[PDB]
Design a protein around this ligand. Structure first.
Ligand SMILES: Cc1cc2nc3c(=O)[nH]c(=O)nc-3n(C[C@H](O)[C@H](O)[C@H](O)COP(=O)(O)O)c2cc1C
Ligand SMILES: CCOC(=O)c1nn(C)c(Cc2ccc(C(F)(F)F)nc2)c1C
Ligand SMILES: CCCCCCCCCCCC[N+](C)(C)[O-]
Ligand SMILES: O=c1cc(C(O)O)[nH]c(=O)[nH]1
Length: 368
């Protein structure tokens, strides 16, 4: 498709002259007017994957934080992705921290951000998602595409369980899966990663979803089933904390763990020396991949893993898969590679699996 080529003409210009968050706003604006390219290709049946009975037509989606409000789901999915995680959303809208709060380092292909859960609130985002689902009833390019919702707490909230229960009762019907975000470094959130607190949070979320069904058509999503429950983990933990959390995740029978969110322990990027927030991009890959391996070993391979962190090429994706991941999420790749992220990474992964001696992608999950 020549449209990806035409777009890459402006990528370096964007990185050099346009503020990052403004670049992101431009991205969403172009997609709102249905001007982004379309991935016209066909996905390899040998590259599909799944988490429980949630089936992904390909192993690549957009991570949370990119379309925080679901204003652009169709166009982002039609770039070539199989799923998108909208959010993180909160019961009421928040403006976030003061701008600029996103900083890029092109040399290291890394980003640091302190957004602060800026979003339009659960009500407006629920409206946007209902409209998308109506369009999806007709759009054949969007058939079988998955939409997940990441939910969080408002800054000035003490009871996280309240905020998450409001969101579930509002938008749960419309989501294929729900991602619990207790790993953002820019809001008392990583405190909720304490084993006991986390176990209560998870079991509460999973009860509010089950309660949606007890009160009797219902599931207005892609799967026609109740949404699965994922947990997004921060990588800034010691082995003891990782073992305890893995026990909690197994005890609550969550459906998947997203490894991982941004990290605050990177300090070989001189450009970010004076900045605060979580770091993402190529500098997070090795940290993120190792974290997958640990949790893959700690949970006895019983919890599917959604990989997130420094995935730019099919080789990185295969690293994640061969570490224990079943599906991959992109974010920084879209920042530094433009619209072609999905098409290019699908092409490369397909070639890799065909050459490395794999009948299909699911055969590569695990394999150390
Ligand atoms: C500007 C920005 C905003 C983000 N917002 C969220 C968010 O709201 N919720 C969330 O779970 N992760 C959020 N993330 C983390 C990403 O979803 C992803 O986990 C992380 O960037 C690592 O992936 P990557 O290396 O491909 O960028 C955000 C990341 C960035 C850079
Ligand atoms: C949250 C962090 O987002 C960013 O900082 C960011 N930076 N760039 C260059 C991009 C990709 C991009 C955006 C817009 C355009 C276009 F306007 F040319 F179309 N091309 C590429 C993003 C996203
Ligand atoms: C439309 C028949 C099913 C009724 C209940 C769910 C409706 C939600 C429609 C979302 C789009 C789903 N799909 C499979 C058509 O792409
Ligand atoms: O989960 C999150 C949230 C934010 C933010 O909104 O600031 N940033 C991240 O890096 N991860």
């Amino acid at each position: 498709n020549p449209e990806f080529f035409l777009y890459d003409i402006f990528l370096k210009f964007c990185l050099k002259y346009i503020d990052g968050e403004i670049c992101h706003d431009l991205f969403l604006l172009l997609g709102k007017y249905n001007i982004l390219p379309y991935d016209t290709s066909n996905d390899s049946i040998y590259a599909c994957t799944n988490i429980k009975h949630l089936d992904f037509i390909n192993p690549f989606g957009v991570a949370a934080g990119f379309d925080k409000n679901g204003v652009c789901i169709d166009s982002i999915l039609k770039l070539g992705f199989s799923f998108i995680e909208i959010g993180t959303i909160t019961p009421r809208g928040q403006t976030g921290n003061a701008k600029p709060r996103i900083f890029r380092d092109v040399e290291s292909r890394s980003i640091i951000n302190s957004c602060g859960f800026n979003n339009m609130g659960c009500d407006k985002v629920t409206e946007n998602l209902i409209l998308f689902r109506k369009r999806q009833e007709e759009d054949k390019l969007l058939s079988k595409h998955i939409v997940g919702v990441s939910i969080g707490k408002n800054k000035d909230t003490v009871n996280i369980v309240d905020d998450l229960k409001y969101c579930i009762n509002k938008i749960g019907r419309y989501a294929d899966y729900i991602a619990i975000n207790v790993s953002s470094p820019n809001t008392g959130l990583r405190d909720n990663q304490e084993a006991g607190k986390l176990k209560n949070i998870i079991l509460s979320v999973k009860e509010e979803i089950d309660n949606l069904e007890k009160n009797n058509f219902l599931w207005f999503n892609t799967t026609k089933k109740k949404p699965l429950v994922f947990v997004k983990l921060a990588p800034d933990l010691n082995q003891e904390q990782k073992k305890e959390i893995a026990d909690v995740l197994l005890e609550t029978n969550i459906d998947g763990m997203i490894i991982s969110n941004t990290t605050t322990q990177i300090n070989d990027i001189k450009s970010f020396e004076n900045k605060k927030g979580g770091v993402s991009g190529a500098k997070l890959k090795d940290i993120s991949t190792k974290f997958i391996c640990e949790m893959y070993n700690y949970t006895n391979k019983q919890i599917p893993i959604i990989a997130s962190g420094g995935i730019f090429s099919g080789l990185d994706a295969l690293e994640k898969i061969e570490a224990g991941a079943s599906v991959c999420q992109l974010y920084s790749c879209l920042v530094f590679n433009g619209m072609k992220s999905a098409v290019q990474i699908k092409r490369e992964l397909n070639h890799l699996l065909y050459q490395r001696g794999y009948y299909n992608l699911k055969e590569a999950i695990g394999r150390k």
